[PDB]
């Protein structure tokens, strides 16, 4: 769609990794909420991030969200084997359903 993410990213065990999420001003970013989901292929997703920054219940503090004027980001610190999967961002406000990004597959090396 019009919301573009980095197609692929990889990080080593115990380190961090950042996923990007950007698009036209019609979808991003200022005055628009961003959410992050962990979405393994073929399965139902899990909400990681809502309201840009605010993490979902039970989510580890290793996950953090941050939104600038031009792009949004999701930062995974202290990478683990379970972090190796597919992640999606969403652009939303209140009256408009989710608009998903192009997707990023995270690989955990080492």
């Amino acid at each position: 769609s019009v919301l573009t993410q980095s197609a692929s990213v990889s990080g080593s065990l115990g380190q961090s990794v950042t996923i990007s999420c950007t698009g036209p001003n019609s979808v991003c970013c200022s005055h628009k909420s961003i959410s992050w989901y962990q979405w393994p292929p073929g399965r139902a997703p899990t909400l990681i991030i809502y309201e840009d920054n605010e993490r979902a219940p039970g989510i580890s503090p290793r996950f953090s969200g941050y939104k600038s004027y031009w792009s949004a980001y999701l930062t995974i610190s202290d990478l683990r084997p379970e972090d190796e999967t597919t992640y999606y961002c969403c652009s939303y406000t209140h009256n408009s359903g989710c608009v998903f990004g192009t997707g990023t597959k995270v690989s955990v090396l080492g």
């Binding site: 769609s1 959410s35 209140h94």
Partner: protein, 130 residues
């Protein structure tokens, strides 16, 4: 709480199919029920949401004329949980409509993201073929 969706259906293109989403473990009347789909060709696509409490619906423009979302009235279990059922009927199926469909419970009763899909069901696989 648990969201249990109908299993799977095979439908020919041009036909219609109705997916169900039975809920339990939470107050069905309070959280919005969203319908989101996933296909291999176009990725994740949000279809719409419906309020079990008021009946208010919000459909994405791409599905406003071929998707019908309905809900039943919540069946009380104790006081803080209930069981319910929502349905989504999609018609005029095409090959690109083949994929997995999800119903999802909202995040908060009030706030800046009330409808935000938070608790998801296991999904219903819809295949359109001859």
């Amino acid at each position: 709480g648990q969201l249990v969706q109908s299993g799977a259906e095979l439908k020919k293109p041009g036909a219609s199919v109705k997916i169900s989403c039975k809920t339990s473990g939470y107050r069905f009347n309070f959280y919005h029920i969203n319908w989101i789909r996933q296909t291999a060709g176009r990725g994740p696509e949000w279809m719409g949401w419906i309020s079990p409490y008021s009946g208010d619906k919000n459909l994405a423009p791409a599905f406003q004329d071929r998707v019908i979302m309905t809900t039943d009235t919540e069946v009380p279990v104790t006081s803080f949980t209930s069981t319910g059922a929502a349905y989504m009927e999609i018609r005029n199926l095409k090959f690109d409509d083949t994929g997995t469909y999800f119903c999802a419970k909202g995040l908060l009763r009030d706030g800046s993201s009330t409808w935000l899909p938070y608790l998801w069901g296991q999904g219903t696989l819809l295949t359109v073929s001859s």
